[PDB]
Symmetry: D2
Subunit: 248 residues, 4 copies
């Protein structure tokens, strides 16, 4: 006797191909969460149809194909509102700072689509691993400064199409240092020095990243998180910034 906002399949693991900024087609494994709105006067959705769209679907998952999948799901399941969400690991070939030795780095990307109330919204979320270094530990200590691996997460509601790599760079750029999978000894020296030279508190990280998200038209709203897995503790330091530019 009541409508259900989300009703559908969840945790469907299924192969995916994305297209890199470099034009390459990247093959990965995704986890899909496809759901639809059920009108009160409807007893139940057709669950076999979700798995069928995933099997029928083909090609690289471009921004346009993503939107075409959301519409195809609503037409095939006979719905007016619904959401599609896929999570997958994404890889970028990076270049070491001094040696130039190429190596891959792994990011976690979640892509979401949602049509409700005649409005379609696309969301880009990337978790970017980075190195942080406390400025206090550096300032009060004769030698050394505590450093920890950090996870910067950018859940951005796109006003225009934004490459995930555009969000990864903002993260790596405003971080004390960015992670690389292979580092030569000349490279270990530079990363250890540049981090010490650029110590940033979690409040500084999220602030420095937010300013650049603020200044981007393609981002109408975003949730920004930064977690420092403190070496000196068994807990983490956490900071979240929420901004909807449509406010006002």
């Amino acid at each position: 006797q009541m409508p259900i906002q989300r009703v559908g399949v969840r945790a469907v693991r299924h192969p995916l191909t994305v297209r890199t900024a470099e034009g390459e087609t990247q093959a990965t494994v995704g986890t899909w969460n496809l759901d639809v709105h059920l009108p009160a006067d409807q007893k139940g959705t057709h669950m076999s149809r979700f798995v069928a769209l995933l099997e029928e679907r083909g090609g690289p998952l471009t921004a346009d194909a993503f939107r075409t999948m959301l519409a195809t799901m609503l037409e095939k399941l006979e719905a007016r509102a619904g959401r599609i969400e896929v999570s997958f690991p994404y890889f970028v070939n990076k270049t070491a700072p001094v040696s130039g030795v190429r190596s891959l780095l792994d990011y976690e990307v979640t892509l979401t689509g949602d049509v409700r109330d005649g409005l379609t919204r696309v969301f880009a979320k990337v978790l970017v691993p980075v190195t942080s270094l406390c400025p206090c530990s550096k300032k009060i200590s004769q030698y050394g400064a505590h450093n920890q691996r950090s996870h910067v997460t950018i859940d951005a509601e796109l006003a225009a199409d934004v490459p995930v790599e555009d969000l990864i760079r903002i993260a790596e750029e405003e971080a004390s240092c960015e992670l690389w999978g292979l580092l030569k000894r000349p490279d270990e020296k530079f990363v250890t020095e540049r981090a010490y030279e650029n110590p940033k508190f979690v409040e500084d990280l999220v602030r420095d990243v937010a300013r650049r998200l603020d200044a981007d038209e393609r981002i109408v709203a975003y949730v920004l998180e930064a977690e420092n897995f403190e070496s000196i503790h068994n807990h983490s330091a956490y900071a979240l910034i929420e901004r909807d530019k449509r406010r006002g």
Copy 2:
């Protein structure tokens, strides 16, 4: 860096906890704490150290009113005007088997959240209840048998007035095809298998039946109800979400 941060603090701090039962008995459980505060735009950083001190000093059972005293003490000790406390912990209920009566303990995952922002104190209670599901379709189409799977019903509830988790569990255990038990006897296995078969329910029916009972409690202003069936026939889960705010 001239920008406020809605949430800065410590994350994933495990620490021993004592809570108060509906009976008023105290249960000892381990908790994972999240303590964060709002940071003004002209403030460089909050005191991470103080958040842990509040956990070490705090003692005694975690009564609702005690949870509200802690949220104020946090703002008072970290010199903030807004902030949130989150704590999740396993919760046990001695259960009575349906036919034999053999007592057995069942575990649940409870999360309490308090939040002060814009001069409003809001308390939440989220519980995960483990329950059995049985497909109405399998039962009708098949000559014999009916596929059944373990389900997870999650009730996140903003409580205008305090409500025991026991009260939340009941709405889910009662509205499920059948409740779970740790110890069952041959008499009790027959009842659970027969009763579940006699009350088949789709993920859509389950959330709808739990919503109607959550809609009828004055204490619960708002809620986000989730039901996930781990389908035996597939390696993917069925899902349904109902969100209701009684203010709107």
Copy 3:
């Protein structure tokens, strides 16, 4: 002043391509654990070299390439003993029982190589999701019978090259019913009936699977596990069988 049996990198996520029994090349994401033995008179291994073998390596990961990687690692790291281990999700296009509707299913495959004491050993481990159904619940109940999703894991030490798909079939074949991602209504009926018709206890599952591993020459030893995620309980039923045919 002492040797270290395993010393190296761990949790290196990195893209992988395997070749299916159907000749196809399957692209997936792997997690690598590459380690080497350190002689007492050696202070430390070269960790940058592990990541370099992964970046340098190419082609589908065939059984032969896997062995050639283990040797290349020992030669490149200047070791006499060492281990390589990659974990990745693997997909098979299955056909529904009555409708024939094709759909993918996801398995977790771990491949291990180890050279020690002049002996090289290759191990194949596949986790196969399956449906189980209690024979007691069926025997003591007027209607219905409890059914749960199960995970059958086969860690087999190969005496000859064995396709992972050969191990997945043994698992799906001796199970009450095998999982399919897309099932039509004719298909739901068959899977619900065949399971009820073939109820098997966890002790029966592992026994029925072991007999077929026993009778396979390509398997010199294996660890077999079966976990039933009981619908009627919040815990699981577990059975493990260990067999080394070289015993005697």
Copy 4:
């Protein structure tokens, strides 16, 4: 089906636990239990129900001797001659900060295993100690700074004579670059940053230093020691394993 099963029983049963401290104080913690028995070849199946009954009836602190009484009661109640009990739980130790002395609790993950097979009773103790690591290479090559990461040292120890976990933690906390604390003050952050810098250690050095101290305890017949550095500079971990059996 004419084949023995080395391990049949229940898995992942969470249940509240009380353990005894080296001080003799009792600590309340939640446990996840694994109770299995050996099944003869001519036996169709063990009684799953009895395993949970043993957990409900059992009370009082989990003293070593009490753990050994439970292993016998299990074989006696399930009518078996071989079997294993495993229980893992968070463990806390009030810690004292190095300069200020501010007490703070730190958590560890402890796993106790008992095993009767071939008429031998074997007790084990596995603990995970959270510790900080600092690279000796970064310290030498770099002009300023030194990269540091949180590490996990795991000691699995077959105990001929009972040993408190406190004794295991000490060997790891002492042999690490620096121990972890929940609450630290500006004086204590300086000490930890300086001390860790003053005692750099490679994953290989750490396991080697912990082994020598584990080799010198008569109570510990055998052990598998693991050390994993979550390197800040990379998204992958350093690893080292040392396995020693003092019988061989």
